[PDB]
Design a binder for this molecule. Sequence first.
Ligand SMILES: CCc1oc2ccccc2c1C(=O)c1cc(Br)c(O)c(Br)c1
Ligand SMILES: CCc1oc2ccccc2c1C(=O)c1cc(Br)c(O)c(Br)c1
Ligand SMILES: CCc1oc2ccccc2c1C(=O)c1cc(Br)c(O)c(Br)c1
Ligand SMILES: CCc1oc2ccccc2c1C(=O)c1cc(Br)c(O)c(Br)c1
Length: 557
Amino acid sequence: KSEVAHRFKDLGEENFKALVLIAFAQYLQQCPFEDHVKLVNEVTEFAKTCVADESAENCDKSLHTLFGDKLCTVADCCAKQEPERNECFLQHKDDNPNLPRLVRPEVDVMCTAFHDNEETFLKKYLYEIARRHPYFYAPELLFFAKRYKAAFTECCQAADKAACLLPKLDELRDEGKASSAKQRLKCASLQKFGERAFKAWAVARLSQRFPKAEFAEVSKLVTDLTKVHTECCHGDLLECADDRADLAKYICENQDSISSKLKECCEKPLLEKSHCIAEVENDEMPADLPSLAVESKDVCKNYAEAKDVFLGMFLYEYARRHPDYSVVLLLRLAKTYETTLEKCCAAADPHECYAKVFDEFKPLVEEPQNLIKQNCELFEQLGEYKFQNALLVRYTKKVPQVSTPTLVEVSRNLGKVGSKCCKHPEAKRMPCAEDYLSVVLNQLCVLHEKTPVSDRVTKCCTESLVNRRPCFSALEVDETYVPKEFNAETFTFHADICTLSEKERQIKKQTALVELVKHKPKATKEQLKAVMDDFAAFVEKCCKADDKETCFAEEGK
Ligand SMILES: CCc1oc2ccccc2c1C(=O)c1cc(Br)c(O)c(Br)c1
Ligand SMILES: CCc1oc2ccccc2c1C(=O)c1cc(Br)c(O)c(Br)c1
Ligand SMILES: CCc1oc2ccccc2c1C(=O)c1cc(Br)c(O)c(Br)c1
Ligand SMILES: CCc1oc2ccccc2c1C(=O)c1cc(Br)c(O)c(Br)c1
């Protein structure tokens, strides 16, 4: 009947009022905080009326019809019918809304705000986060909200408040921005590549996680797991949160049929039990696993009868025994097995045709393995910071048309891949290094899709997801870009480049590094090292030693 009262009865008042605040923040990202709370409380009071009587007025309307009405009370997005109106909001989700940045006030200032109005301080947290990230995971933001409340609850009455709160707030910023681009990858995989390619992706990853389960259960998982993200990316956060919450009850209703590391996983509350399974470790692979059967006479019979089930079962049986290989590499091996099967089964002697099919995977498996150990030898020999600077010049020349801040954020996330995963043995480098790069590059694709400038990046992102990383590798040197004219205001740093912390000083030095390549791309690697050291030494020597404010505004070159 009334779907509004249905979700309110299953999600609860605390979650219903929180999900609506996130949905409105993702749609109308420009309106202030006070205007959104007036609509949420109006919907919350509306929801409580339909629960006491399902046969009430306006309760039978869909969730998209009611949300669009309350949102249109304040740029030509409520046009034509409802399916086009709600789709207008999804097309205007600005990946970077050019909003004022968030500053971190003092610790004693935040605890006085948390102790004054504890509900507003938590409500303003979900509003400011969801408005910057329109594609943020709705039920996972509630998990961060619970810890954001517990962080201020414990360490605002402690002795040294900054000794605990800031470490908890610094660790919470990293998980949030990592989950911002991780979920953004799943939304772009559904909107741009449809449900067919996204479903095959989840089968490869879940089979590596849960090899002890059967394909019939993984199919029930992936089908139910895909329906959740299709709702969260479309803005159906009320639906998205419910299905994920009841899925964790289904996964843990029978743990032996799914995995084995789910005992202490589901010993936690509902919000915490849904987070443990999302990043759980891979189950132990069942030993004495067979090889193939690609040798029977019914290979073409099972494929012609069901092409999706046979290819889906092959990817499952291949991923359950290969945890050391990523999903992008296995999907590449899956697309090769399909191509080698369309041409062999259409002949007269297919068995002799697809006989040596697994030998064709050798060049595709050794291609990423010989590219990870090569790039990490320079990461463990130059440092994480200099690794990003070497990757800055490596990417500023391959695509100089891209903006200045975009090349810095993408390289800093690329440099964080070596320091976070390439310290692991030779059994976990290939999975993470390709899964982490698929998130950083996708973050560079959605940030470039707003205002595109470079054409080599557009076709690189518009290509297949499995061939997205190989395209970005050797994207030419772009020996045809005219460098911008010499700008002086971009290189001159004011006297306020010293009151910032040590972290912000590195982002400014990297911002000026890509700005130097845009002025002279033909500069050598050593000609930039001396210039970078000179500029850093000038600011370091002028500001650390007291020398007024005109000493940092002279003439460098
Ligand atoms: C007034 C206190 C406060 O309000 C917010 C609203 C949205 C997101 C974070 C915060 C926040 C923080 O404590 C915070 C913590 C870290 Br660490 C940051 O790097 C930034 Br920026 C902000
Ligand atoms: C505890 C504070 C905090 O919680 C988060 C949850 C998810 C994503 C980011 C954050 C975050 C930030 O520090 C933060 C920092 C900057 Br800068 C932003 O522009 C935004 Br927005 C958020
Ligand atoms: C086991 C690791 C894993 O890798 C994926 C890749 C694509 C889509 C889903 C998953 C997935 C999940 O099982 C999963 C389960 C829940 Br519950 C989530 O809230 C999220 Br997020 C992910
Ligand atoms: C950051 C760690 C890392 O992990 C990998 C796994 C496979 C292939 C390359 C890499 C790699 C790189 O250093 C790297 C370097 C350049 Br230059 C690129 O354009 C791209 Br893309 C990636």
